[PDB]
Ligand binder design. Structure first.
Ligand SMILES: [Cl-]
Lengths: 74, 250
């Protein structure tokens, strides 16, 4: 499944995921492109912060979904 | 060049809302001095528009993208690295970290062979800490030392840390090579628990406080990934001047 990850600046990257993938895996894919350690990535799928230990299937993430990567202190 | 002034200048750009947008943009391929406020804001506008406007964007993402940002560690380290290293050509810190990587042991074996007349910077990806930071090692004829430039979300063993709070004093504190080798090499693994808290707090905590280190959040047996490169202090100086101009000529 192709999804988009979009940062605060509007930068988009496209990530290829499987429904069995953990959100931690998705962050690994983001790190390949952005450098950002998964530990400090926050990914928001619309409304909620995604927990590293749940899956894409768990969050029912769909083709074309935009996840937002927030690279800022809380 | 006054190196202490370069750091104050970064703080001043950070504290300016348009300086902030220039410094902490996430375009890694292009030169940091090629960033353009009109285009940056256009792209925020478009982004907000996709979500149905600023109100819903905030409801859905939780933040206002027009507000000044406080960069997490990879965002501050990658950006300051470009500011230091770029001269005639762009440096992509994501690409360079992956292709030019040494570990903490190779860093310890080699730092003593670096030229006195030259300036170097290490982009450190600490896989024990899950944290990125810079070590600036500028030319020093009394004794080569390092300066740590960092910020922190605060999701590892250390508290949240704002880039300007860190840089005002602690980023100007010199760190002996002896101590950097102890932090980064396999030597770190032989330290006791208290010795680890002491060293991590000394090097990385704003208030050098041992109780600010959650030792259980440090991943045991892991290493560090380092991209070490030479840089020209004149380029660090002029890149900062170029960004300051963007503001004074707005
Ligand atoms: Cl501009």
């Amino acid at each position: 499944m192709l999804i988009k990850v979009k940062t605060l600046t509007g930068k988009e990257i496209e990530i290829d995921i499987e429904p069995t993938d953990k959100v931690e895996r998705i962050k690994e894919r983001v790190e390949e492109k952005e450098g950002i350690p998964p530990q400090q990535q926050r990914l928001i799928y619309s409304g909620k912060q995604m927990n590293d230990e749940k899956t894409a299937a768990d969050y029912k993430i769909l083709g074309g979904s935009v996840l937002h990567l927030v690279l800022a202190l809380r | 060049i006054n190196t202490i002034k370069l750091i104050d200048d970064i703080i001043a750009l950070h504290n300016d809302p348009k300086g902030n947008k220039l410094l902490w943009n996430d375009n890694w391929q292009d030169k940091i001095i090629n960033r353009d406020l009109a285009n940056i804001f256009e792209k925020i506008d478009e982004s907000v528009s996709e979500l149905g406007g600023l109100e819903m964007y905030q409801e859905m993402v939780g933040v206002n993208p027009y507000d000044p940002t406080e960069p997490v560690s990879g965002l501050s380290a990658q950006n300051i690295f470009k500011l230091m290293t770029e001269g005639e050509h762009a440096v992509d810190p994501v690409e360079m970290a992956q292709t030019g990587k040494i570990d903490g042991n190779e860093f310890a074996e080699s730092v003593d062979q670096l030229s006195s007349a030259k300036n170097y910077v290490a982009l450190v990806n600490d896989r024990r800490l899950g944290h990125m930071f810079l070590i600036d090692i500028p030319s020093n004829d009394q004794e080569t030392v390092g300066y740590i430039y960092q910020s922190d979300l605060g999701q590892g063993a250390l508290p949240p840390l704002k880039i300007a709070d860190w840089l005002n004093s602690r980023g100007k504190d010199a760190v002996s090579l002896n101590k950097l080798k102890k932090l980064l090499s396999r030597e770190f693994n032989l330290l006791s628990d208290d010795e680890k808290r002491a060293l991590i707090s000394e090097t990385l905590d704003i208030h050098k406080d041992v109780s600010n280190v959650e030792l259980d959040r440090i991943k045991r047996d892991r290493g560090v990934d380092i991209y070490l490169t030479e840089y020209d202090v004149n380029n660090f100086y002029e890149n900062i001047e170029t960004l300051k101009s963007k503001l004074s000529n707005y």
